[PDB]
Amino acid sequence: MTEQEIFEKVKAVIADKLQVEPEKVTLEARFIEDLGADSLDTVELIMGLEDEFGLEISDEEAEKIRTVKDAVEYIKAKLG
């Protein structure tokens, strides 16, 4: 997958799980400060990424993904 295609899929997952318009899910957006994610949203977002990409993100790694960019970069690195 290209980084662009990963971004598009990540954006879709975030829009769904955090209930925000796709337009607000920019590359630098912070899940908490910019998208208002609460505790339930945080776990739903991680699981959403795991379901969409078929990967496993450890609780440790998850705690480190703060922005859309962090998610995209993490996924692109894992997938190849």
Side-chain angles (χ1 to χ4, degrees), residues 42-43 46-47 50 56-65 74:
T42 298
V43 68
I46 294 299
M47 279 183 46
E50 293 178 314
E56 294 302 322
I57 303 168
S58 68
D59 293 4
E60 306 80 291
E61 299 175 304
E63 300 184 61
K64 301 296 181 177
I65 302 176
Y74 173 85

Side-chain angles (χ1 to χ4, degrees), residues 5-64:
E5 301 168 332
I6 291 173
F7 174 71
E8 291 297 309
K9 291 184 181 297
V10 166
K11 188 185 182 88
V13 171
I14 295 173
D16 172 51
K17 297 292 175 288
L18 277 51
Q19 278 293 64
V20 292
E21 287 299 310
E23 302 83 290
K24 291 184 67 294
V25 187
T26 61
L27 188 58
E28 314 307 310
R30 294 161 293 184
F31 306 145
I32 293 173
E33 297 95 326
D34 301 314
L35 308 179
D38 59 20
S39 297
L40 176 59
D41 294 331
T42 298
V43 68
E44 283 290 319
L45 185 161
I46 294 299
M47 279 183 46
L49 292 176
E50 293 178 314
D51 298 317
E52 176 60 39
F53 294 99
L55 44 64
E56 294 302 322
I57 303 168
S58 68
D59 293 4
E60 306 80 291
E61 299 175 304
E63 300 184 61
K64 301 296 181 177

